[PDB]
Design a protein around this ligand. Structure first.
Ligand SMILES: OC[C@H]1O[C@H](O[C@H]2[C@H](O)[C@@H](O)[C@@H](O)O[C@@H]2CO)[C@H](O)[C@@H](O)[C@@H]1O
Ligand SMILES: OC[C@H]1O[C@H](O)[C@H](O)[C@@H](O)[C@@H]1O
Length: 445
């Protein structure tokens, strides 16, 4: 049925700075909101921190040799704000810029296109003390950081992403208390949600000004396929509300200068601190939309989430170790929705992958058939998306290697490369050896 991807398709792997880098005190780095959040009891399921992680700081060169073995033509990573501006603003930490210059230099000389995420959830603690995401001052703080780092790197970085997953930043950070800084307040979530969009909009012309005519920028949304548990009229209303909350809350502002009206009303329209010209800033034209896709969420009328009055149903099917339903059709559905409704000139899958229990065999191999089947089904959905005329330009697997899985710690392994945390040994997994032939064939056997 299906083989070959377009000739210039970007095959990638993805990481974030706090998840892989470690060396949290090295070279003038100040603590991030995650360094502080990991101290909180019950915050990390395994009681771990990102202090060491994969030691990608002291070890990037070896990790790039592994990407060459995987045959990626693209690597997606984040830049740690805590290393660039340790005081949050003002004094540039030259050693911090240096690391990202060495990283980008070593990537380009191995022919790997760098895709840089500016914010992947690791705001300096000291800056959070002045401007939490719910404080409108955060916008100019982020623009300043954007300005400093885009001035140093845009000679060599063409592809820039503003913020990773506004929903996670605002709801998990400020609404559910599950992510740094660990606050639980409807108003704080809605304000943080708005300042993430504004921070995205205000950064766009700074990225373009500090670049060339080749510079491309956009935001990264997490989007999952949402499913009504039944056709009961109040189960379909529950699903519609969770869809608005999860998928439409950022996409509608970015393309149509509006929040989803009925959920805005349900919340209390006043809680969102919209000022004049905010939607003009939020709608600033992007070169692409980056999508982070993992699962189908099936919703019923209920009160688990008391804010949304919904319960979650697990339909019969396959579940990852995160307890996420495997649903490749979902990826095709999300990409087609975005295509038909927002017509972005380019789409990237900047994240997709799965956590399964990995073991090193006596032979020293990691046999992950369930991860391999996850990836195969989703690459298949992406291939169908391209055949339907959807302008998908690349696909980045989450993740290059096992890393700090935020509130799950190291117990959840998303790598196509295994990490023995005892020694920092990388073992390419079966899923990784298969990916290595997918990249070289530029499609599926
Ligand atoms: O760790 C479990 C975590 O899962 C969900 O959060 C996901 C979300 O579905 C994704 O779209 C993704 O980008 O990021 C999240 C981080 O894992 C749950 O909603 C969340 O409460 C839960 O902690
Ligand atoms: O929580 C699973 C994934 O969610 C998000 O998409 C993050 O960018 C990634 O760091 C994490 O692994």
């Amino acid at each position: 049925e299906p083989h070959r991807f377009p000739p210039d398709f970007q095959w990638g792997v993805a990481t974030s700075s706090y998840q892989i880098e470690g060396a949290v005190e090295a070279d003038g780095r100040s603590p991030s909101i995650w360094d502080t959040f990991c101290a909180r009891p019950g915050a990390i399921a395994d009681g771990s921190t990102g202090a060491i992680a994969n030691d990608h700081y002291h070890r990037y060169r070896e990790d790039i040799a592994i990407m060459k073995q995987l045959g990626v033509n693209a690597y997606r990573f984040s830049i740690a704000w805590p290393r660039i501006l340790p005081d949050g603003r003002g004094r540039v930490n030259q050693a911090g810029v240096d690391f990202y210059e060495r990283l980008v230099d070593s990537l380009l000389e191995q022919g790997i296109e760098p895709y840089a995420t500016l914010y992947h959830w690791d705001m300096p603690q000291v800056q959070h003390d002045r401007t939490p995401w719910y404080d409108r001052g955060v916008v100019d703080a982020f623009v300043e950081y954007t300005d400093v780092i885009t001035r140093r790197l845009s000679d060599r970085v063409k592809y820039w992403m503003t913020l990773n997953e506004p929903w996670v930043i605002s709801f998990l950070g400020y609404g559910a208390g599950e992510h740094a800084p660990g606050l639980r307040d409807k108003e704080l979530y809605l304000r943080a949600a708005h300042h993430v969009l504004l921070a995205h909009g205000k950064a766009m012309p700074v990225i373009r000004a500090n670049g060339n005519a080749q510079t491309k920028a956009g935001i990264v949304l997490n989007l999952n396929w949402v499913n009504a548990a039944s056709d009961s009229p109040e189960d379909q209303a529950a699903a519609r509300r969770y869809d608005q909350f999860f998928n439409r809350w950022f996409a509608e502002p970015l393309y149509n200068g509006r929040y989803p009206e009925e959920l805005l009303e349900w919340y209390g329209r006043d809680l969102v601190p919209v000022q004049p010209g905010d939607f003009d800033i939020i709608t600033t034209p992007t070169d692409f939309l980056a999508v982070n896709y993992y699962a189908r969420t099936t919703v019923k009328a209920g009160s688990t989430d008391p804010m949304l009055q919904v319960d979650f149903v697990r339909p019969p099917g396959e579940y990852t170790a995160m307890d996420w339903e495997v649903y490749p059709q979902g990826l095709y559905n999300i990409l087609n929705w975005l295509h038909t409704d927002y017509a972005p000139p380019a789409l990237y899958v900047t994240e997709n992958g799965a956590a399964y229990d990995d073991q090193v065999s006596a032979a020293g191999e990691v046999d992950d058939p369930q991860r391999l089947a996850y990836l195969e089904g989703h690459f298949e959905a992406a291939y169908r998306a391209i055949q339907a005329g959807i302008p998908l330009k690349g696909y980045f697997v989450w993740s290059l290697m096992d890393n700090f899985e935020w509130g799950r710690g190291f117990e959840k392994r998303f790598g196509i490369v295994f990490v023995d945390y005892a020694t920092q040994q990388r073992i390419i997994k079966r899923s990784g050896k298969w990916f290595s032939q997918v990249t070289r064939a530029n499609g599926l056997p």
